[PDB]
Amino acid sequence: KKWGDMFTWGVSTSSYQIEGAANQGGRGPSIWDTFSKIPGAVANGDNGDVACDHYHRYNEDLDLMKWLGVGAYHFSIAWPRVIPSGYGALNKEGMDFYDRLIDGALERGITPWPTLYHWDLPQSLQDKGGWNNRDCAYWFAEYSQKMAEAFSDRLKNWITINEPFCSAWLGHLYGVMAPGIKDLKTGINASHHLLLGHGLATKAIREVSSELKVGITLNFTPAITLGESSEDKLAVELADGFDNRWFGDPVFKAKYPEDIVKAFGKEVPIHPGDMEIISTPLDYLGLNYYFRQTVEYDATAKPLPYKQVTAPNVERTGMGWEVHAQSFTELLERVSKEYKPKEIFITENGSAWDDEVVDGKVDDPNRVSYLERHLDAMFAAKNKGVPISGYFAWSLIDNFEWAYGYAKRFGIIYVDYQTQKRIPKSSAYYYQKRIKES
Amino acid sequence: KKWGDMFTWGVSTSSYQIEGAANQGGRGPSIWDTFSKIPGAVANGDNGDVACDHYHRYNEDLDLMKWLGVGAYHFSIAWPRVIPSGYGALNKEGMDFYDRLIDGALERGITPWPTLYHWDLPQSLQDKGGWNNRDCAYWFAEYSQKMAEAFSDRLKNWITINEPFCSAWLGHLYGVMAPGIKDLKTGINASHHLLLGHGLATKAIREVSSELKVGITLNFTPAITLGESSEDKLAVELADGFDNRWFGDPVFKAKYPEDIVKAFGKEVPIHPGDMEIISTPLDYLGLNYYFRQTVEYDATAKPLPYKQVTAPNVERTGMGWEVHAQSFTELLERVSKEYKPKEIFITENGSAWDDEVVDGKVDDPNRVSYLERHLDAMFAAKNKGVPISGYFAWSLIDNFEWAYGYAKRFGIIYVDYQTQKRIPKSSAYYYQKRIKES
Amino acid sequence: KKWGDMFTWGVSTSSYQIEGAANQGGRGPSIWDTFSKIPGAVANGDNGDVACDHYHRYNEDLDLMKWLGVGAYHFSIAWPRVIPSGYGALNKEGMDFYDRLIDGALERGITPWPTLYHWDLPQSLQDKGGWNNRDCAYWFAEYSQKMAEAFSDRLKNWITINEPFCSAWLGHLYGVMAPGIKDLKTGINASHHLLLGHGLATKAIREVSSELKVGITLNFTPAITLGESSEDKLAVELADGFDNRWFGDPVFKAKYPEDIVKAFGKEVPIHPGDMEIISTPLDYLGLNYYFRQTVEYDATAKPLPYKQVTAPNVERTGMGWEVHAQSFTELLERVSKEYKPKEIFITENGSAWDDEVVDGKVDDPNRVSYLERHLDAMFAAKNKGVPISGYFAWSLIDNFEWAYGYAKRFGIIYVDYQTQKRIPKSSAYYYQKRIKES
């Protein structure tokens, strides 16, 4: 720690999870509007039609960010709000919303960090195959260029896509996220076109202005096993390849992990130039971390011969996810050594617990404890030399947690969905203190 | 200095010294209401009936704290305001006041740090023997548990008692503070029941919720001598034992200092189990420091054979207290090595000088200089590895300085008692700068 | 970097460059009011009659400082506004303006840092010879004492004069700044009387109160050559002596550089006591840096045998000034070794570029880049042990850039002179981020 070093504190959200106004302001439907209408797809039949009504309440939320003292707000632009047909005319009303949001953040001293793709693909493009269609990578790059042309006079730090693991595998192989497809080959195609879209968008953004910075957000789930057999060690290697190296290796090493390619037995649809584009240099890696996975070998499992294990006697959040902050330190060290990103921003970390409103307040000590321990673990890595330049808490506010719906609350600020009232939780006051006093 | 380390800047007050409204809002009398009615007990016949009228003016005072930029407000709860009879019924109007104060601080981003006992024992309990009565330790612990039950949803860092040296020795041996008693055995009893109350309250607070942190505040007065004789060196040891080790050794070593016990020749009323309670582990030590004492041997002095000396040719405050910041560094190092508290917060440090209002302003360069030098001395200890986690300036505002009355002004903000106007002094602007720029 | 170390972030302006109200509020004319009426003296015939109208709009400018988050505001007092006759009666209306400015800054948590002389000598004193007249040093010291008597209850950190290189050589030898004289002996006389005025004023300020701190602001222009001949190396020494050592050596070494004295062939008008006064100890050096100069030997040049060279293929600002941040680091190290000031404040650093307003906003990436690189270079020196205690950006707002007029914009905030609207530039948002996150 020397004179001149900086560190950025932020909060993170995404468009479909908070905005609402799903059928207002000219917005066209996304794959999540469609998916959340399918009986059984989302807990309690929840959807994002209203969410946190942030489309109308953004000034209140920006005021809460200023009150917390964050220097940065990591948010996503809803592609179907700004280009409802996916590829074609801009929706001026949608662009004006993001102008008002950005200008309001800047007036309050907050730097907006936009993510271009946080899972809300326009249904108009899914009707053409979505991410299974190679053209979707190019449609995304054109949308990205239009956003940079409109907003990069003010916004200098961009993220292309968020968590391709979820969009590709959960959305096209396991079918538990939109668009709900269940096919390995489609998942492989989608993974390649998400990554190609990232690379094409990066190049397009840089053509707008050479001062702009660009990265990608990857979630990493470190894998362990409780067994000692050679096959259980193989299970760890397979899970790590499927979750992590499948996406990190193309970006930083210009190739897919050969052990996983071989185990799939399928071809990735790589065309000339693709791997050069996907591996284009980035200004930073956005890293998301929540938990580690415990696995064991299972010869009957598909597409790869391993299964998840629920380890006994470990601390778990309201999601059932293991709490293990030491894995965060070790992951940060591993990524820095293995992939050597120029710098790292924690674009998401946080936890969900059963919250109760008592006397108009929300006391959430389990969320405070998770936050304290994960900030400590992150700084332990920074003190070892890992170039972590900022931390963005997921999330500012409780919101639509995808297939879990509204029942799973990640906010440091509580949202009463009956009234839309925001109530800062104990974790908000803790985070506010950490921002000021570090 | 490494990534993740934090430091807390605060200001400190106490309830009887600032609140006023002594016979309003359901408050019952304290031993200081009674003591201040006795001619000769307090300079100028001053009392705390009105003080700074903070009970009515707290919003203005919170606004001044936000303007200073402090992250923390160290305050005390008036036991006789919330439980006028000492044990038994809660006074709703008093509890509501502290709720409003706490909620107002949090709205402004300020963490309230409550002290449960800052010398205003309910007169109803003094009528039953006060701290001479072992039951007072249990009455205090029950009061503490009720406060944690009411406020610990928001308040996570607690202090039990403040400066038992003053309550025990000055209040029961020298009779210069309330309740004005002058008896060595009573002072010994009171010291044990204050410390036992601390331990019982700590255990009771932790039973409310396991996330809560608890400490005690001790003032330390380092002792030196100008002489070279062996008896003058003994005088230093005795004065150090009387002022400092008598209270620190029970808390951190589970025993009273044997040399002082022997010199007193009296029994401490220790019941089996008491020392384990008194020495229960703490999250932090609150340390108060203002000055060092100079002593010499005096065979005629009681209860111990030493006397205070007024060393010649040294800088002194308006209290007549020596200014010697290097002693602060050495004290912090000594406490850290001898008692090994997990962390230390400076809960009080400051100085009093004759202030003059000129053109509606107060320029107080001697207070600025004391503050600068003592902050430098504190950071010198931190740079040697002492875990000092925060500094709270005594005081936000001029107030009732106990037996000195209002004539002695410790505020960084001046109070005109005729109008209750608050005027920030030069020291307020200096402290505001230090909070921002360190 | 250790615990307790502080760093001050500021912005800088000067009175004639921003205030306007040149013939209002009792102000008398300065030498710049006169000079800017001379055809050909100032680009576009610009003058400071209106400037940024800060005399009326200071509340808005102070609000912008608070919004940026600076802790300090470096400004100058207009001698002809407060004493229109130069020596004699105070203009109460002018003094009241500075009271309002100072009190407004303090209400916002901003420490004002006054410069007493930033080039706007009263014309009433120029009519008596200005800085050519030795009495001007004493007139300046009397003015300085009156300002300290009025304002030092609040203002503790003073600067006497700013950039005597400009007032002496550009104003009296080259005639490109007011008062427009072109005579070497007059320039020598002026340089000595400026420096004597600095010393006399320092002594007078300290007589007002011993807590007050005083420094001087010097601009340094490091010199290099592209040639290898011994005569080109001599050119570097001459340029360094003329620009830098002529003013630094009297202040820190109590003598004028003998090589330059010999080359001028003229006597400096040194009287008994002068060099002791000029070299009086200072609490800090205010350092101004913008660029390095490239020179070569030229036997025909006067007063010294060197000329400026425009080095090929280097980055340059809108002023034509080379951008070379590494020279800033090396200058700071050299000053610390050569002159050993107790501490250094960067009282000015910044850059000018042609700005364009697009959609009501100003995106100035070249100014951002200069700022980023010069802050990095400054902190590189601090990390080597140079005692740089703060940085003041020139300037908060676009203003009257002397003989260049309004066409040259140094602000991080744009001023539309038709409307007086202030528009924060991208560089303002960058500086705001750096202040918060370092």
Author numbering:
A (entry chain A), B (entry chain C), C (entry chain B): 2 to 439
Provide text from the study.
Here we report, in contrast, on a naturally occurring mutation of an otherwise invariant residue in the β-glucosidase BglM-G1 that balances a trade-off between structural stability and enzyme activity. β-glucosidases are enzymes hydrolyzing β-glycosidic bonds in substrates ranging from glycosides, to glucosylated flavonoids, glucosylceramides, and oligosaccharides, releasing nonreducing terminal glucosyl residues (see Ketudat et al. for a comprehensive review). They are also one of the key enzymes in the bioconversion of cellulosic material. Our data indicate that the natural mutation to histidine at position 75 leads to the loss of an extensive electrostatic network, including a salt bridge in the active site region and implies that evolution of BglM-G1 traded a decrease in thermal stability for improved catalytic efficiency.
Comparison of the structures of BglM-G1 and TmGH1 monomers revealed a root mean square deviation (RMSD) value of 0.53 Å over 313 Cα atoms and the conformation of the active site glutamates were highly similar. Upon solving the structure, we observed both in wild type and H75R an unresolved electron density within the active site tunnel. There was, however, a major difference in electrostatic interactions between the mutation site and the active site nucleophile. The naturally occurring histidine at position 75 in BglM-G1 formed only a single hydrogen bond with the backbone oxygen of threonine 116, while arginine at position 75 formed, in addition to hydrogen bond interactions with residues Gln163 and Thr116, a salt bridge with the catalytic nucleophile glutamate at position 349 Fig. 2 CD spectroscopic analysis and X-ray crystal structure of BglM-G1 and its H75R variant. We then determined the melting temperature of both proteins by monitoring changes in ellipticity at 222 nm, while continuously increasing the temperature from 10 to 80 °C. For BglM-G1 the mid-point of transition was at 51.4 °C (324.6 K with a 95% confidence interval between 324.4 and 324.8 K), while the melting temperature of H75R was at 54.9 °C (328.1 K with a 95% confidence interval between 328.9 and 329.2 K).
